[PDB]
Design an enzyme around this catalytic site. Structure first.
Site, PDB file in Angstrom:
ATOM      1  CG  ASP A  52      -9.647  35.629  17.057  1.00 35.44           C
ATOM      2  OD1 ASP A  52      -9.319  36.584  17.795  1.00 35.44           O
ATOM      3  OD2 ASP A  52      -8.829  35.047  16.310  1.00 35.44           O
ATOM      4  CE1 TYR A  57      -4.529  33.848  12.218  1.00 35.26           C
ATOM      5  CE2 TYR A  57      -6.870  33.942  12.771  1.00 35.26           C
ATOM      6  CZ  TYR A  57      -5.542  33.980  13.159  1.00 35.26           C
ATOM      7  OH  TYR A  57      -5.234  34.154  14.487  1.00 35.26           O
ATOM      8  CE  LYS A  86      -6.043  37.359  16.242  1.00 31.67           C
ATOM      9  NZ  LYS A  86      -6.693  36.420  15.288  1.00 31.67           N
ATOM     10  CG  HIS A 117      -1.637  38.327  14.111  1.00 28.88           C
ATOM     11  ND1 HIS A 117      -2.431  37.869  13.081  1.00 28.88           N
ATOM     12  CD2 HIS A 117      -1.457  37.273  14.943  1.00 28.88           C
ATOM     13  CE1 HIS A 117      -2.713  36.593  13.278  1.00 28.88           C
ATOM     14  NE2 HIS A 117      -2.134  36.207  14.401  1.00 28.88           N
TER      15      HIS A 117
END
Lengths: 330, 330
Positions: A52, A57, A86, A117
């Site tokens: 994931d 990120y 996401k 998200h």
């Protein structure tokens, strides 16, 4: 020597697609971004088939790098893996763009699951020093979060829908959401055709999310649990009941907090950069119905939401004030 | 309500390929051959992703017919399924023929797993009335099994390897064996290049097969348990310890006898024609290390092998005299 390992359990999404119940989380700190690569490699080698990640990120390239090497040396095939990414609120209305950037970063042709998200829309503020030339979480000088004036959070999912339903588009295998309330899911179910396969939320014995679990089960939506250890400090390992039951099932607290979700049909994505604990923490504690109720009772008695940043404040479920430290003094 | 279901558990074969831990057995009685179709359909709709069959069963056409209808209405895709078939000793030296014949009967382009059914070789006796124009299990006028005089059982496995290793042959994804002893596996390992992915044998609380389990684990060969209820009259359901643990884990006796194997990392293929029983018996009893030792100790004190036909008598492990009923007095 006992089975199943949590790496050996697969749940079925509402479109018939199987997802590994255990996945590796990759929302790692900025100073440790590059450590993601060895964590993904370690995870897959230990048997993880689920990674994931997210556009926000900044770990997609390192996820992509790890996969590339395991593909090249014949350790894994693309079809063996389930990859989630996401769309961040800054690109709430530019899903197509978000996906292509994610796929480029990952060096992949498709992702298995693409999520919204947050049910949020941010203003697009230029910054060469941000992500893809944009401020990730824009604030003004006050400094309060800059939400998009024309923003409708459901536009993101509607655009996700269109990519998923396009017979000439093979970039996704499933869509879903993250951080959605019952109320927002109801609006989605009312206004949209595709039922989200997952709702990825913070949940763990300090935050059982009972009503959401009941709702999602009634509507064919699987929960994915993030921050199952309670984020920073792993405070959930300190819960006496967690320690007790870990001892009883001859597993670590880590295994117990993972099993808490998988036992209840909830997908779980613990984040780690430690290759040793990643490889080791794959045991299953098949908790009884009464033990689950005990754990869930604890959570209702001492509710703690660890992930509650200022930007989330406008959401009725989120305060924006982080965790309540008073409920950790049990 | 709780997870995993036994349909949600996947083991890894030594070539990387995942196999569902739970499979449907299809060695159905001659009077009931056609009933296999509804059983397969019921299994797959209930979540089974593993069907086990054989050239010798005469159930392949009904397995294939069930699969075809599920493919055609979009209930399932081929790649979602794990299909096993087997080469019978009458075609011990004609594996290619056996495979092609099975593929035709199944209406498939490939099987996931192809097994040597027995470490035996039968003479070819012509009978237009038999299977593929041959007597399935030939006996002479004296009533004794007619073994192939020039027969070497390992030649079957060597033909399996050739098909498996051929870069231009995509009829199989894995090979293995059935009813092999430690000694036969040892000769296989010494003489052959491909490690069998499975050894399919009768095993259950009455026949724990402790020594074979240890050997197979060490050499990365998975066990597949057949006849887990103990064949006719499902005698294992009556084991006091089985009923006891079933009540404890809030599961049926069927579920407990399945879980016994899955917990130990053993694939299990219960045979059933009851669509309601197939659908409901998917619960998992995560037996402790102590409870498994209780069950295994029971098998050592009360050993009963239920599958032991005259044709298997020449094998050191088999007597040909069926079950020892004196160990059923409990």
């Amino acid at each position: 020597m006992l089975h199943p390992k949590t790496t050996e359990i697969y749940f079925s999404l509402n479109n018939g697609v199987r997802i590994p119940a255990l996945g590796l989380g990759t929302a790692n700190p900025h100073e440790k971004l590059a450590e993601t690569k060895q964590a993904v490699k370690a995870a897959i080698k230990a048997g993880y088939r689920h990674i994931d990640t997210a556009w926000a990120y900044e770990t997609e390239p390192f996820v992509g790098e790890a996969i590339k090497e395991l593909l090249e040396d014949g350790s894994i095939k693309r079809e063996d893996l389930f990859i989630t990414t996401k769309v961040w609120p800054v690109l709430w209305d530019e899903v197509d763009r978000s996906l292509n950037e994610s796929l480029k970063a990952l060096g992949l042709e498709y992702v298995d699951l693409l999520l919204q998200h947050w049910p949020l829309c941010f203003e697009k503020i230029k910054d060469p020093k941000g992500i893809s030339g944009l401020v990730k979480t824009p604030v003004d000088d006050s400094g309060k979060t800059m939400y998009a004036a024309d923003g409708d959070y459901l536009e993101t999912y509607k655009q996700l829908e269109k990519i998923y339903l396009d017979p000439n588009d093979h970039r996704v295998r499933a869509i879903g959401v993250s951080n959605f309330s019952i109320e927002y899911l109801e609006r989605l179910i009312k206004e949209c055709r595709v039922k989200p396969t997952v709702n990825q939320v913070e949940t763990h014995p300090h935050l059982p999310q009972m009503e959401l679990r009941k709702f999602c089960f009634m509507h064919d939506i699987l929960l994915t649990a993030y921050s199952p250890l309670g984020s920073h400090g792993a405070p959930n390992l300190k819960i006496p009941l967690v320690k007790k039951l870990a001892e009883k099932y001859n597993v670590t607290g880590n295994d117990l907090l993972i099993s808490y979700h998988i036992r209840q049909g909830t997908i779980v994505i613990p984040r780690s950069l430690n290759p040793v604990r990643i490889s080791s923490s794959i045991e299953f504690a098949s908790l009884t119905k009464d033990e689950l109720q005990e754990l869930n009772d604890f959570g209702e008695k001492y509710p703690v939401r660890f992930i509650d940043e200022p930007f989330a404040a406008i959401l009725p479920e989120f305060t924006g004030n982080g965790p309540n430290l008073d409920n950790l003094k049990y």
